[PDB]
Design a protein around this ligand. Structure first.
Ligand code: BCL
Ligand code: BCL
Ligand code: BCL
Ligand code: BCL
Ligand SMILES: CC[C@H]1c2cc3[nH]c4c(c3C)C(=O)[C@H](C(=O)OC)c4c3nc(cc4[nH]c(cc(n2)[C@@H]1C)c(C(C)=O)c4C)[C@@H](C)[C@@H]3CCC(=O)OC/C=C(/C)CCC[C@H](C)CCC[C@H](C)CCCC(C)C
Ligand SMILES: CC(C)=CCC/C(C)=C\CC/C(C)=C/CC/C(C)=C\CC/C(C)=C/CC/C(C)=C/CC/C(C)=C/CC/C(C)=C/CC1=C(C)C(=O)c2ccccc2C1=O
Ligand SMILES: CCCCCC/C=C\CCCCCCCCCC(=O)O[C@H](COC(=O)CCCCCCCCCCCCCCC)COP(=O)(O)OC[C@@H](O)CO
Ligand SMILES: CCCCCCCCCCCCCCCCCC(=O)OC[C@H](CO)OC(=O)CCCCCCCCCCCCCCCCC
Ligand SMILES: COC(C)(C)CCC/C(C)=C/C=C/C(C)=C/C=C/C(C)=C/C=C\C=C(C)\C=C\C=C(C)\C=C\C=C(/C)CCCC(C)(C)OC
Ligand code: HEM
Ligand code: HEM
Ligand SMILES: [Ca+2]
Ligand SMILES: [Ca+2]
Ligand SMILES: [Ca+2]
Ligand SMILES: [Ca+2]
Ligand SMILES: [Mg+2]
Lengths: 308, 72, 43, 257, 318, 72, 73, 41, 42
């Protein structure tokens, strides 16, 4: 039970539905978990470059040395604050690659720069840092792997549904829509462009897989269908909200993160960071929103750091 | 006793109806037969699809006539 | 008063055979469990 | 192109028209079956003349029910038996005005106390026996304990006074259930009351009949033979109890607020 | 207040009634009738006896084979655990074949059990149809209950056999679950553009609302004149008493027209059957003739048009 | 020790036929239930591939292997 | 010490047969329920793989291993 | 009333109490074994 | 009397009812003392 009163935000014409509903007691749990990190004082300008002073820099070579050290202080406070600087080095041999965390970290720096520069159709001028997903822990909280399903007899193949389904909002819908959509690249659209029978050959099962993915979009942001659609025509772009256009880019963005960066790391990481089928943990909508309409309610952290 | 303990057993059918019992036994046995066959067919002991003594779909796919037709 | 029509002699007879049958059934159960423990011990 | 159109006429459209025409046609037939009772109706004219009119659509052609056990044929729409002799005075001089009873309202057969003129034969079972009978003629019935046996209780009558005492139960053999209670009244007559107008209190051992007053139980219509009841008598009894819902107290027909 | 006639205050028992005599050559009725006090508080207390002949045994063999199959597959989907079966019961189901198999007969654990259960359930319902027909006709009554049953069977076969065949896939049919079949309902509305703009769907909803209205009205009216013997409808039909007269005056005065004690039952019949006729017509055209019900409604001048104020850019056009 | 002397009088208040039927039905239901509960655990004996896996045995028969080679 | 003397009179107002049936049925239902509640916790004794895991024992038999090897080719 | 006299009630009560005591004894024994095998508190 | 019990029968029933209720509440108190010793909740 969620006892009244509630908070309602209108987001459309009057008498059409189209509004978002909040319970003040549940929203307090999301407010009580954000915790924007504290600023790091800007670095003294000018000096020698990192490429001319350090021995093994392959990404951040065009920062001054002050900017470099500042970036490293930030990487410690964002990812691994408990274990300290030796989480990704040996003792004080900074230039060694003897740990896998340094390879992982280098690849992650590249991925964050790519998202911050090339995907502004989705993260527009707020960008991301490490803290957007690690939130001060080495392993992020909300990730996914390819779901094998419940245990069934050995001669029975999986259909991929009719269970509880914890990632698709507790429905009996297909329980793993991320493999075909957020790592593979399948068509999400199912409806026709004319009113009578034409060349469209999609089925009700494909419609169910789409419905599953949309359920996850709703849960990961704290909203309903009507945050981006008018239900009377889920396929018309002239009857959608403006928020449908960033989500369209978000999809593509997530595929990039998983195809170019995170899945190829399956060689470097240990067996601890993999699932039943032997693939690493991957990124969702929930990996950075974590139940809010913008990660951390949209505080712009990434502008203060020229390394990202 | 231990030997005369089951003497009056034949009197059972003076309190249990023979017709109801017969029908119940027959129906229960048929239901149980279907159930056990279905449970064993859904395991590793399955005997229709195990491809022993030979696989027949595979045998049909590799007949020379079918191979020559697929080659074009 | 709730009654079944059986006298005390009929009740004694029924009870004799009921107890014999139950004892035999439990004997068979014990035997099945000894075999199962020998094949696949569960505790 | 999202909303391109190839052709305006399709099958869904035609099928919808066909449905509009298939409805619109069962309405016709049902409305015609509705008029096998009570028609032709009586239209009052400009200065009082009455004619028979028939409505839209017109009345159907008569059909016949063949009743069992040589119970005759019933043609419908067919003739009617003659009304009895109700007296009424109109209240306002126009065709749509209401009427007032002329004499004692309880014994007049107008208003909620009107009844129909049915056959003077009992309703029968599938074997040919009378259907509603006292529990001494039907010797196989018994009241289920766990339930208050009404035989013996008193019949308080809506103003607190006593009407009489229950002496018999009348059952229904085709569907086993209670239909009437028989009671001896204040002047030692035997009268019936329908079971659907009685509130039975087991502990008080009372039957409350909210319809009529205590003294009113002396004038309930009586039966010819007390081993059966006919359709006409059922109507008379029930109608007498229904007249009291508006005529028992002079304040009952008089605008709550 | 006054007695409302909702519960039976006093109950009476006589020996059980075996039933109207059947034509010579019939089988006896099976069972000894028992009485229920709680069922007698609201209705008739006798339970049984029952008539089992040729058609009602073939039915009941088919139906139970189907039920065994459905139950066992639901149970195999949790690994045979009955505890998990009870725990997750509303989420389990038997699923149709993958749509790529078309109309062929697929292997047993990838849709063949669904096909078996569907076939056996079909045969069960057709044998039951024959039973209902013969039972009413051997007692000398009109066969009106078989016509309505035929309509219902036709709707079961339309969604399930006829539409999947006309589409070319068994994977277009519902599964056997609770939440699974609700998911099917929502998905088929989402795929074919909004069932609210299907006109046969609107008409069947009209007739389902109307069924509830009409049966509240009739149940009320007959309980309200049961003090004048109105619950005995056969006699009020073949010899009109004061109960029928009051019942028809009430509606005439209230809304201007009325039915008779026999005609209201024809209104009931039709209101229950048009609901399902429109159900069949609406499902049979979806997918096979119309691909988007909202675009159809727009082409025929039916859908409203909310004011816009903005412009959204379709990113597939950019 | 003489506390259970009159126990045989139980059948003068409890119906023997009803009791017999109840016992039989309950025993069958419990048998089915316990077999299903143990088969759905680590003790499962139909699918455990002991003493050998039969589907795997059918996939590696020389005839099936030679047919699968000539297809591929 | 003398408070519970007339207790045997309980069966002059409560029916013994109804009470017996109620007790038996309740006890069976409770037996099933407690077994199911304990099986769904950390105390479960069928799936705990003690004293050994039997599915794991079947997956690593030499015959099954040798057959799974000759399929990777 | 149940139709039992006071003697019949005394008889029934005797056997009822004996049976209940024996049942509870068996329950206690089962729990001692379970505690020895798998202690839960 | 609406239940058919006389005053003597009511006195008898009341005596045994009160004794039984007291014993039951005693057992409840004992269970709670043990639970507090094992796992205190306040
Ligand atoms: C790892 C688990 C073991 C296993 C461990 C056990 C254990 C432990 C027990 C059984 C028992 C039984 N097992 Mg086993 N069992 C296994 C696998 C199977 C398989 C199978 C398809 O795999 C089947 C079909 C069975 C079937 C059976 C039944 C014979 C018996 C259940 C009787 C019953 O419910 O009566 C209940 C119904 C009634 C009492 C109705 C009364 C009818 C009258 C009395 C006649 C009935 C005949 C009766 C079924 C059998 C008597 C046998 C004769 C002497 C030949 N087991 C596996 C290998 N099985 C039980 C048993 O042996 O009982 C002694 C038992 O305790
Ligand atoms: C998001 C979902 C969509 C929606 C998607 C659908 C779909 C899809 C359909 C409907 C259909 C209907 N919808 Mg809709 N519907 C929506 C919203 C609504 C709303 C509303 C208030 O919003 C209402 C009031 C309705 C109302 C209705 C009914 C008028 C109609 C169902 C007829 C019926 O009684 O079937 C129940 C009756 C049967 C199924 C007959 C079964 C008969 C046989 C004989 C059964 C015997 C079984 C046997 C004995 C036991 C078997 C054993 C077990 C299987 C194991 N819908 C929204 C828009 N709706 C149906 C329809 O008519 O389409 C036009 C339909 O197909
Ligand atoms: C870790 C948990 C332990 C375990 C801990 C316990 C504990 C603790 C207890 C049991 C009890 C029982 N356990 Mg155990 N039990 C475990 C695993 C099992 C398994 C299994 C498949 O693993 C089974 C089948 C059982 C079965 C049983 C029943 C024999 C008994 C419950 C009977 C009942 O419900 O009577 C209810 C029905 C009635 C009272 C109706 C009337 C029946 C009349 C009086 C006669 C019935 C005969 C009776 C069932 C058997 C007695 C025969 C011998 C004389 C002992 N346990 C595991 C290993 N189990 C209970 C018990 O032993 O009670 C004495 C009990 O207290
Ligand atoms: C941390 C919490 C504790 C716990 C804290 C408590 C507390 C506190 C209480 C109980 C009580 C009970 N607990 Mg505990 N209990 C725990 C774990 C368990 C577990 C388990 C599977 O883990 C079980 C099966 C139980 C079961 C029980 C029942 C014995 C008892 C409730 C009986 C009842 O409601 O009768 C209601 C039914 C009636 C009143 C009907 C008539 C009853 C007649 C007269 C006979 C019933 C006999 C009686 C129940 C048994 C006691 C008899 C003596 C052996 C002489 N608890 C855990 C360890 N539990 C209650 C209790 O002890 O009552 C005295 C109680 O107050
Ligand atoms: C005109 C349309 C309406 C209608 C009409 C209708 N249905 C009918 C009839 C008629 C006129 C019958 O004469 C026929 C009948 O004999 O009922 C008494 C029947 C019937 N409609 C039934 C159910 C039914 N009708 C439904 C719908 C409708 N029936 C429409 C709304 C629905 C819905 C809306 O979902 C259901 C579930 C059955 C009670 C009965 C047909 C019985 C039958 O075919 O049984 C034989 C086959 C078997 C499967 C035997 C095996 C055991 C069964 C599982 C027992 C049945 C129990 C019951 C179905 C429980 C409900 C289960 C569900 C929760 C899954
Ligand atoms: C509006 C206007 C312009 C007014 C000007 C006119 C003036 C000046 C005044 C007129 C006076 C007054 C007060 C008029 C009010 C009436 C008006 C204007 C409108 C109301 C009309 C109205 C609400 C009708 C709706 C009718 C509909 C759609 C009904 C739905 C249900 C339906 C289809 C029922 C058909 C089946 C029927 C007839 C059921 C009734 C019925 C039932 C239910 C039985 O059980 C029963 C049992 C035994 C015998 C008979 C019956 C029986 O007839
Ligand atoms: C030598 C072989 C011995 C066979 C001897 C028995 C003769 C064959 C059956 C007799 C028969 O066909 O009888 C019919 C039974 O129909 C039935 O089984 C009907 C069921 C038959 C088919 C069963 C399987 C169903 C097939 C698929 C579904 C068909 C769907 C059609 C539905 C419209 C009619 O039954 P009754 O009128 O109630 O009986 C009256 C007397 O005949 C007996 O008292
Ligand atoms: C078929 C069952 C139909 C039950 C009717 C619906 C009751 C809704 C809950 C109302 C309680 C409330 O005022 O608010 C509850 C709220 C809604 O949801 C919650 O917080 C619920 C939290 C858990 C409550 C679940 C108990 C379910 C019991 C209902 C009856 C038995 C089934
Ligand atoms: C554990 O349980 C046991 C085994 C002990 C038994 C217990 C049984 C239980 C608990 C069962 C539970 C059942 C439930 C919840 C069922 C839910 C059912 C629902 C809600 C179903 C809803 C819809 C399904 C529909 C409409 C299916 C329609 C299918 C049709 C019409 C099939 C047509 C197929 C045909 C005619 C066959 C053609 C095949 C062929 C051979 C011609 O193809 C070429
Ligand atoms: C404040 C403590 C830290 C210090 C003092 C520090 C110091 C350094 C130095 C001096 C270098 C350049 C050395 C060289 O390669 O020649 C370096 C590189 C690097 N450090 Fe750290 N570091 C710290 C914390 C971290 C942490 C927490 C991470 C892991 C999150 C990390 C990851 C890296 C990576 C990936 C590089 C390589 C950068 C590149 O390739 O361009 N460091 N660090
Ligand atoms: C597929 C899952 C995703 C969906 C559907 C999605 C959707 C959206 C939407 C709709 C917005 C605009 C919010 C608004 O204006 O109300 C948004 C903003 C944002 N998202 Fe995502 N997102 C997803 C994944 C991610 C991921 C993985 C990250 C982190 C890498 C991320 C970071 C951001 C940021 C930073 C913003 C705020 C940008 C701004 O201020 O305009 N999103 N997202
Ligand atoms: Ca890229
Ligand atoms: Ca084989
Ligand atoms: Ca094995
Ligand atoms: Ca174990
Ligand atoms: Mg599904």
């Amino acid at each position: 039970c969620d006892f009244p009163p509630q908070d309602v935000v209108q987001t459309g014409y009057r008498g059409l539905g189209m509004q978002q509903n909040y319970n003040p007691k549940l929203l307090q749990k999301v407010i009580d978990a954000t915790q924007v990190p504290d600023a790091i004082p800007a670095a003294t300008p000018g000096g020698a470059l990192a490429k001319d002073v350090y021995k093994n820099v392959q990404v951040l070579g065009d920062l001054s040395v002050n900017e470099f050290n500042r970036t490293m202080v930030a990487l410690t406070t964002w990812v691994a604050p408990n274990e300290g600087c030796t989480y990704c080095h040996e003792g004080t041999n900074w230039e060694s690659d003897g740990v896998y965390t340094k390879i992982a970290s280098r690849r992650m720096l590249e991925m964050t720069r790519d998202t911050n520069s090339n995907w502004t159709g989705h993260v527009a001028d707020t960008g991301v840092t490490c803290y957007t997903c690690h939130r001060g822990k080495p392993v992020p909280e909300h990730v996914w792997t390819t779901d094998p399903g419940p245990d069934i007899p050995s001669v029975f193949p999986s259909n991929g549904q009719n269970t509880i389904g914890y990632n698709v909002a507790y429905t009996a819908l297909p329980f793993d829509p991320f493999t075909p959509f957020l790592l593979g690249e399948n068509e999400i659209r199912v409806s026709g462009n004319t009113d009578l029978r034409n060349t469209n050959r999609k089925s009700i099962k494909q419609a169910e897989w789409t419905f599953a993915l949309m359920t996850h979009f709703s849960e990961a942001l704290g909203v309903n269908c009507t945050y981006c659609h008018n239900s009377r025509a889920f396929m018309d772009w002239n009857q959608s909200t403006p928020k449908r256009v960033p989500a369209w880019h978000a999809i593509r963005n997530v595929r990039d993160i998983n195809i170019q960066y995170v899945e190829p790391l399956g060689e470097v990481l240990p067996a601890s960071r993999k699932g039943p089928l032997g693939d690493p943990f991957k990124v969702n909508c929930l990996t950075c929103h974590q139940g809010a309409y913008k990660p951390l309610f949209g505080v712009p952290m990434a502008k203060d750091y020229p390394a990202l | 006793m231990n030997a005369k303990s089951f003497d009056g057993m034949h009197k059972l059918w003076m309190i249990m109806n023979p017709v109801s019992t017969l029908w119940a036994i027959f129906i229960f046995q048929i239901f149980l037969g279907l159930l056990i066959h279905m449970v064993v067919l859904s395991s590793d002991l399955n005997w229709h699809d195990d491809q022993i003594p030979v696989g027949y779909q595979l045998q049909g796919e590799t007949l020379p006539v079918n191979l020559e037709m697929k080659a074009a | 008063k709730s009654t079944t029509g059986l006298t005390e002699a009929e009740s004694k007879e029924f009870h004799g055979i009921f107890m014999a049958s139950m004892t035999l059934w439990f004997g068979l159960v014990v035997l099945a469990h000894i075999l199962s423990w020998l094949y696949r011990p569960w505790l | 192109e999202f909303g391109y159109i190839t052709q305006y006429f399709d099958l869904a459209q035609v099928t919808l028209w066909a449905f509009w025409l298939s409805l619109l046609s069962v309405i016709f037939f049902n409305r015609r079956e509705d008029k096998r009772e009570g028609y032709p109706q009586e239209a009052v004219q400009i200065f009082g003349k009455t004619i028979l009119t028939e409505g839209f659509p017109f009345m159907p052609a008569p059909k016949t029910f063949k009743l069992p056990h040589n119970g005759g044929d019933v043609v419908k729409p067919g003739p009617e038996r003659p009304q009895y002799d109700f007296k009424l005075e109109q209240v306002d001089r126009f065709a749509g005005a209401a009427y007032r009873p002329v004499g004692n309202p309880m014994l007049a057969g107008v208003g909620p106390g009107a009844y129909a003129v049915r056959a003077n034969k009992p309703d029968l079972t599938n074997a040919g026996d009378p259907r509603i009978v006292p529990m001494r003629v039907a010797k196989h019935f018994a009241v289920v304990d766990k339930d208050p046996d009404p035989r013996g209780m008193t019949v308080i009558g809506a103003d607190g006074q006593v009407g009489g005492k229950v002496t018999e139960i009348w059952v229904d053999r085709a569907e086993p259930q209670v239909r009437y209670l028989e009671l001896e009244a204040g002047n030692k007559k035997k009268v019936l009351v329908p079971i659907a107008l009685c509130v039975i209190k087991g502990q008080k051992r009372e039957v409350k009949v909210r319809s009529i007053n205590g003294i009113h139980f002396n004038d309930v219509p009586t039966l010819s033979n007390y081993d059966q009841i006919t359709l006409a008598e059922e109507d008379k009894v029930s109608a007498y109890y229904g007249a009291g819902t508006l005529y028992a107290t002079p304040n009952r027909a008089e605008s709550v607020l | 207040p006054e007695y409302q006639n909702i519960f039976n205050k006093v109950q009476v028992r006589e020996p059980a009634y075996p039933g109207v005599e059947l034509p010579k050559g019939s089988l006896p009725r099976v069972g000894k009738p028992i009485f229920s006090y709680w069922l007698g508080k609201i209705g008739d207390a006798q339970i049984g006896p029952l008539y089992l002949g040729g058609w009602g045994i073939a039915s009941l063999i088919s139906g139970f084979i189907a039920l065994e199959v459905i139950g066992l597959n639901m149970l195999a989907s949790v690994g045979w655990d009955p505890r998990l079966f009870l725990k997750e019961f509303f989420w389990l189901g038997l699923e149709p074949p993958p749509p790529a198999y078309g109309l062929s007969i697929p292997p047993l654990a990838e849709g063949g059990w669904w096909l078996i259960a569907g076939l056996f359930l079909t045969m069960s319902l057709l044998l039951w149809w024959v039973r209902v027909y013969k039972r009413a006709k051997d007692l000398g009554m009109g066969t009106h209950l078989s016509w309505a049953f035929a309509v219902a069977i036709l709707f079961f076969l339309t969604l399930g056999f006829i539409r999947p065949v006309l589409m070319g896939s068994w994977g277009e049919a519902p599964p056997f679950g609770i939440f699974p079949h609700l998911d099917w309902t929502a998905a088929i509305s989402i795929r074919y553009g909004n069932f609210y703009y299907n006109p046969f769907h609107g008409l069947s909803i009209a007739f389902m609302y109307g069924s509830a209205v009409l049966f509240a009205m009739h149940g009320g009216t007959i309980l309200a004149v049961s003090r004048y013997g109105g619950d005995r409808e056969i006699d009020q039909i073949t010899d009109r008493g004061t109960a029928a007269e009051r019942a028809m005056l009430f509606w005439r005065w209230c809304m201007g027209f009325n039915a008779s004690m026999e005609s209201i039952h024809r209104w009931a019949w039709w209101f229950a059957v048009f609901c399902i006729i429109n159900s069949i017509l609406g499902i049979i055209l979806t997918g096979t003739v119309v691909d988007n019900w909202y675009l159809w409604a727009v082409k025929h001048g039916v859908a409203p048009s909310y004011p816009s104020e903005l412009t959204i850019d379709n990113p597939y056009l950019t």
